[model samples]
Target chain A: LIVTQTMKGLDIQKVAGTWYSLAMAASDISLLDAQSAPLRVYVEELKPTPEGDLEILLQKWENDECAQKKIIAEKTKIPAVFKIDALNENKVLVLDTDYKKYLLFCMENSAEPEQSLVCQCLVRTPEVDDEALEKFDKALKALPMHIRLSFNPTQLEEQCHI
Target chain B: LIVTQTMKGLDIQKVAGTWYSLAMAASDISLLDAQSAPLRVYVEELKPTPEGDLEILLQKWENDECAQKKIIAEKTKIPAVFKIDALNENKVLVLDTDYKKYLLFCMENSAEPEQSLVCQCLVRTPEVDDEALEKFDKALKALPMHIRLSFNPTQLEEQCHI
Candidate 1:
């Protein structure tokens, strides 16, 4: 299955801020890096790309110097409309708040259920709401079956001090 | 035309979560897809675009790979338009229950006097035991006469497996 739709509405300006790592369901794909948790995904400045897309540096605290992933997000005038332009799924969905309280992102894969593996990139603030959690439960249940099995939600409480 | 207003104060992020298509307004027009109920529409994988658009992946299990449709919604100004360009004197409104137990998509199309139309798209949970169908009855009564023709509703039930 490819990514065809994304979250309904997201504000990039509001999304550009700091976020604490909450819980995650990472993929099993070997990414050379231990790719362990204690992870932090800080979305810094959002710059527009030449092709009318958005470009940014995703700084990941992977316990190594190699912590930067240059990500290019396509720019669109529509909501939840994915193009044939993504690494994992044909589309991507990002959930968050204008207050930068929390953000959730999920993607799809082109490989077999078993072969479909990737690190979960779920980030949020220290405090969260039960309604959101209840929503999360259903969100995961809505994912691919294999993904449901691969889901290992680990709670991260400490945010590394720079 | 009715439902002059689309959903207000809609949380695009909150709206990004998975939803079950409960009931829908069976369209009278005959297009290749007819795009009717007995249809399963899944929304996920939302990525941010440069122009502030969110690309999404909409998954539908129909064969011939009928291919999921690429729909567009606005997010920048909040209260997503959820509107389309093809329709004239148009408006798209998305309503939901507290827990997203069900969703109501009301579209308004303007036409000559007494020609305006409304399409009622009602989606529900696996078991729509009891819903506020009365609200629909009340809702329609509040609308123009042209909208009466668009009140045809359909239902579906299923649990998709991978």
Candidate 2:
């Protein structure tokens, strides 16, 4: 039998609206900068495509660099595969297709196995205090990226222009 | 046997070059926008993840504003669907992306394009339908920038082919 996994489902609608990028499990995020620069995801609307997939309008970064992504709520149990096109920061390429409750990006460190591995697990709030680091580490394997990695420590902002 | 045609094998390196628009074989396809008549299918960016899947970007003239498509293809596999998510003629619905000598489109259309246009030019047409262009040229205002990408006269314009 093809064993399956149930992700702790997220209420996208409840989780929708304005979301700020909290902390992340250290990865080399060149989300523009070579370092893990901070950013936000603005989801003004969430509709269903005719194909029964969620048509998410992601207004990337103060990101006029706009983009779209389709994610199935039920298909993935714990973390769903969400793709970005041009950039998640717009044009939508969930290039890192790992979105369940959190953003997951599993990547090889610097492109060679001889190199290390990189894993980035992003969350919705600024909760990565040293006291909470362990909690963040254990929170979600929801998304996939890291080795040779350390928290660049996203400059936590309280909220966004939701 | 999924009796299909693969006119050219995958030479992604050679395939990853710039392509200029020549002409498309026009059909009596449907739709309301004379503007979004097919134009160029530019494969501007292609990135392969650590796992060997190519993150693809194909820009198509969206009859209105332009639209971009993101595809993930494993190694040299044809379309995104290794399974039967799509086939020929019927115009497979989702994850229908592939590559070879020449690039073709097998992706999605949002509500507007799918509703406004008769069909996404399925087959790679040879001749530039000037007669259709006359009508297309008339609506050039809406499509500020446009070109022609059509299929052959005998081919099925409703479904993608090799």
Candidate 3:
């Protein structure tokens, strides 16, 4: 049997970038570091309450320097702990604390910016490799404007990975 | 903002003579291997299927003789991936593929064999710290005994890391 262990410390640089939400539950709140522009923020530090559910602590970068962080979402109800079902270099499936599920599309520092970042809807659990692109296409079909707004439409400049 | 990545490979000698189970979905499979045993098996490769799941291949050694081997878990089924969730000099938690969903408690080389292997139900989410003993306790309480017994025990005495 292949057993998966928790990563002690991951190579986080590979995950840094602007990620688009594909699906999310109602209770699941997504926070963005406005001071950091496009990079989103998610805090996992949560505690169980006497009521039987979990209480979440949310923090966001306050200033442009990523200092002076503040709690934007806190003591909020988190229905479940396993919010993220799957994640890879460019895609993610997350379950909102309120049980809302969402698919997220991401773009690494690739050459083609326009074709890079896109979102898609997943009806059921689709095959990761085979249906990922199709799901992304379907998500794009629903919101063409959001996809266009996600990137610089004129400069078409790609984000640098380094 | 702590983004931890999944681990790709592991050294079994670091975690020999332990019990582990399937992490995703539910399964009736268990595995145990020992260091002193003449045979040694290593999960040589794992590939993601078109369905977005994982497929693993194993390599085995018998009496210091190497052999080519190919073993695939039932397709579309949850694959068992084990990890050392906690370790002190004696007790350790082997987190299976179910990802903090379950664990096997084992005593490293003890005088009493029964005390050496114990299975416990655990309810760990994917993002929690692996080293936390409290997380393991929570997971144990989350599962019932029937699910816990699915883990078969094995003993590893003197295996060398390749």
Candidate 4:
């Protein structure tokens, strides 16, 4: 069986704050390609709810302006496993995080016949160090699905309001 | 008041079959861009339900393979208006269609704090004629929102299974 680990005793609040999307890999190549995937946004802030869920504040380019979208990730019994109900139902698992430098997570979309696994590398800064990159590589390798397409989503940060 | 017209009698069946995505213009530029949007897929088939809803079978590149996604567009009181609940709640209205050569529609996202309008140009074949292009331009011009980004999504058809 493929092995994947979630951070134990994860402090959701500590993970809160601004994060930059450095890189992204998805089971579907079009999910990260230039013309096919359209809702490729960046994580602006992560807020922890009192109920233990995580509130994700994401931003994207709309009308040539930065548009913000807020979605609450419902907390699961497991600290690191949260369910985000968006265009698709995503089971977001925190594979690893330094709490200060980087966060690596695997999001599995359970949309039938369109299910996909999307792994992301979010950094505290746009400049990702080699260590973080290696950790991201390891985290993705541990997943059950093969990587179809991977690219740097941070390249679009120039268009953001940040 | 913004004025938009629905087809007098939309024969959903006639609008069915294979259609290629030629171009897309969105209120949010990133929605049609290369990075920020992850669901910039193409319509493979449009099946009409007995309940009057339209079943849209879409395909995208996933895992280096063409992945299919099926969504139902709930029919509204108006024959041309459909409510599609995907990642976001969208009210899709058929702005114009010749029922043979091209199909033009404007989709409005009603997601709170993330509302936007998207105009699409779909054609029977990959080659879009001048008349169809003019109709698409006119439909977009009459929309309430300004078009921020417009691009050819058909370019990715090279990677599709079609």
Candidate 5:
């Protein structure tokens, strides 16, 4: 016997308020890397799947400076429904379809652009533990040397106490 | 034999956007008198009925102020389908459930309070047929005289333009 109930009605007006994209999982690593680049532009389409799952499609532009249109990032498709798994200490754990996980740190009442609280490096695989922290450090180091790292949340919190 | 096919997906997002009340029909004179005051706020809850038609629940507030905790306007059951029976330079005619008709005047994007874009009047019976000029005069006469009619569309558009 199959038993089902209708989902609760959602007030779209309430949900229409802005939300920051703190974390996401991409099925294609190359596409994900392309998205990490500066001056990236893309159109995203989200819809419910026939099997009652959520699907996302992203079409990305190739060149950042040139006006010529060309596709760069591979189209990534994820058949899994995106969901907020848990919240702890003002951070949320998001589990994506590709088994990659992320921690989204959000501050209360933070507005656009500056509102991103933090992005913590969670373990990418079960076998890797604290080693992920070293990888995160190296990635940040490779960015422009003059880029300010003084905005680090942990350091800022410590300074607040003094 | 009754034949059924997948219904066209209603653009819920488009419908979910803000829509100003154009006109109404009511038997009570008090409800009409209160028109000088703002109409009570209500949210539309769309649900599919057993008869395969959309049923709209207009959840009303207790008063024009919507300050108290009680519902004022009784739930008006309207059919999900609405048809524009007539459209012209000066007026628009709408047919609701069972061909109940309503005539709407061309609301001005005016600075005068009474000339604002909000719905001006209820036609009561479908027999009332007046042009934009006539309704403009009628609304001016009907509204309370003391309040300076500086009805600007700025607030209304800004609040719900999206």
Candidate 6:
């Protein structure tokens, strides 16, 4: 009976910065498995383009190595939701975010078989604030997805020093 | 506890051509008011653009006159959903459509104040088929919105014969 709502009047400028993935959840457990190639992504920067779109730069941990991948998320009529045309068609919604501490967002994948939902919590540092953690927990529970919080920030930074 | 789902692998080509507004529903009854300028839109044609987008031409009956307005709906990762950046930011979802007779879709307006939901039923002819009418009723009920089916398609075509 609970519906997930995205942030309203989200300031694109404030959300631009480096963020670390501290936790993750998904509709399917396999999407968040340790070796899941697509889920091992660390947000490097979020830049808002002049044309109202957003450029997301990330350091992806794939094939036991770190690789740089950048994608553009086109702005929809809604400010908080973006459509990304990458390897997979993705619709990302900024569920909630506190620019200084944490950012919680949901990504919906529209692939061949079925639509997959994934929610991730991004923080400024490895350690998350208590309030941020509570917000993330509530958002994840509302999404009704399994939670996983085993992101290794220390190892991630070391892997891709460039 | 029913969640509305859009058409999977919607054939854009088949959904093209002229469609008449048969029935409509909105979260707020005011949106479907007889004199509501924004809500008095008739789908003139739905054309798929070469850039993987959709060009929608509408015949709007406003101020007791008919006017032609064209808008582009950008394709998202989801085939059934489209993002239209017109005077108002709108996200349209093709909930269910039978190319031959009926086409039911939902349009979410992301304007000021708060978001508004509107679901409309379109058909080849002004008189809706029994099956299509049932489908539209089910869609409107699932949306849990107020229904209003007083569309005058004959008056619409007569108003604008250009």
Per-prediction fnat: 0.00, 0.00, 0.00, 0.12, 0.00, 0.00
Runs in model 1 lying further than 4 Å from the true structure: A1-5, A26-52, A61-66, A76-78, A81-91, A95-99, A109-124, A145-162, B1-162
The pairs that clash in candidate 6 are none
Tens-digit lDDT string for candidate 2 (A60-126)? 4344333443333222223333322322221111212123244433222222322222233344453
Candidate 5 residues A1-162, lDDT tens each? 110111133211221111212222221112122223222222122233444333323233334332222212111132111222111112121211112322111111123212222222332222222233333334333221111111122211221111
**Highest TM-score: which candidate?**
4
- Write candidate 3's Cα lDDT for B55-110 as tens digits: 33434455565454543322222223322211211322234333323333322223
DockQ metric, candidate 5:
0.01
List where candidate 4 sits over 4 angstroms from the true fold: A1-3, A35-39, A62-65, A111-114, A144-157, A160-162, B1-162
Local distance difference test, per candidate?
Answer: 0.38, 0.31, 0.26, 0.64, 0.24, 0.66
lDDT of 6 by residue, B1-162 (tens): 332688887988788788777656555434543333355466767888877788888776656678788988999999998998653548888989878789988777655312367677787876635577568767655553532442444533554322
Task: Give the CAPRI class of candidate 4.
Answer: incorrect
Question: Candidates sorted by lDDT, descending order?
Answer: 6, 4, 1, 2, 3, 5
Q: How well does candidate 4 reproduce the true complex, by DockQ?
A: 0.06
- lDDT, candidate 4, equals 0.64
- Chain A TM-score for candidate 2 is 0.36
Give the per-residue lDDT digits (tens) of candidate 1, residues A2-113: 3233466765555554454333332321221123322224343345455755554455555554366656767657543323333444434454333444555553344533
Model 2, C-alpha of B101: deviation from truth (Å): 53
Instruction: List where candidate 3 sits over 4 angstroms from the true fold.
Output: A1-162, B1-33, B36-40, B51-53, B66-68, B77-162
| Model 4: lDDT of residue A55 | 92
Categorize the docking of model 1: incorrect
**Candidate with more favorable, higher TM-score: 1 or 5:** 1
For residue B21, what is the lDDT in candidate 6? 70
Please state every model's RMSD to the true fold in angstroms: 21.3, 21.5, 21.2, 16.6, 24.1, 20.3
Query: Quick one: best lDDT, which candidate?
Result: 6
The structural similarity of chain B in model 3 to the true chain B, as TM-score, is: 0.29
